[PDB]
Amino acid sequence: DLTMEDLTAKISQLTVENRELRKALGSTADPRDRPLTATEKEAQLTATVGAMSAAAAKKIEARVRTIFSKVVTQKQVDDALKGLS
Amino acid sequence: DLTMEDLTAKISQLTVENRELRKALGSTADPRDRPLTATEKEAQLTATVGAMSAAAAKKIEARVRTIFSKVVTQKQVDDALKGLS
């Protein structure tokens, strides 16, 4: 009947519990138990993607240099690229 | 029996023959049969790398995101990155 207000009250109950969890995670002796903000979580995600992407770019360049070293002409590049597919 | 001069004599014979075969290939009728130059081959090489590296970066980023979608604390992040180094 009062569906809107029930969903709002659901957020209120989920919000108070949400912070009661955060206050308990700050009461532990381990600093690494702190909940990360969405900003810090994105910075560590971006740095993680950047590291693995650089690692993937390293192996990819060596892999296709292996196939390109044999080619000398146009047609041969295409068959090497098709060999990469 | 097998001296060093034997190897360098064969190396010279192949270099002078490869120089000639290129000059013949460079004088062919069809322009697509001409051998690629060193920079042209290198330019198409990095172009192939950069294309695959960009596509690999997308799969890496979307993969890291679905892993970060189930973490909150610094301890959870460190354990989520432990399997996927």
Give the C-alpha separation, B35 to B41, whole Å.
9
Amino acid, res. B9: A
Q: Experimental technique used? A: X-ray
Check which CATH number belongs to the domain holding B40 and give it: 1.10.3390.10
**Main-chain dihedrals φ then ψ at residue A35, nearest 5 degrees:** -70, 130
Q: Resolution of this PDB entry, in A?
A: 2.5
Residue B44 buriedness (CB in 10 A; 0-12 / 13-18 / 19+) = middle
Residue B61 falls inside a structural domain = yes
**Of residues B25, B32, B51, the one with CA closest to residue A77:** B32
Token pair for A1 = 């009947």
Comparing alpha-carbon positions, the chain B residue that sits nearest to A85 is B52
Residue A1 falls inside a structural domain = no
DSSP assignment, residue A68? H
How many independent structural domains does chain B possess?
A: 1
3-state SS of chain B is: CCCHHHHHHHHHHHHHHHHHHHHHHCCCCCHHHCCCCHHHHHHHHHHHHHHHHHHHHHHHHHHHHHHHCCCCEHHHHHHHHHHCC
All residues of chain A having their beta carbon less than 8 Å from the beta carbon of residue B36 are 71-74, 77
Q: Which of A:20-49 have CB within 8 Å of B?
A: 25, 30-36, 41, 44-45, 48-49
Residues 6+ apart with CB under 8 A from B68: A41, A45, B77, B80
**Of residues A39, A12, A37, A11, the one with CA closest to residue A22:** A37
Domain encompassing residue B77? 6-83
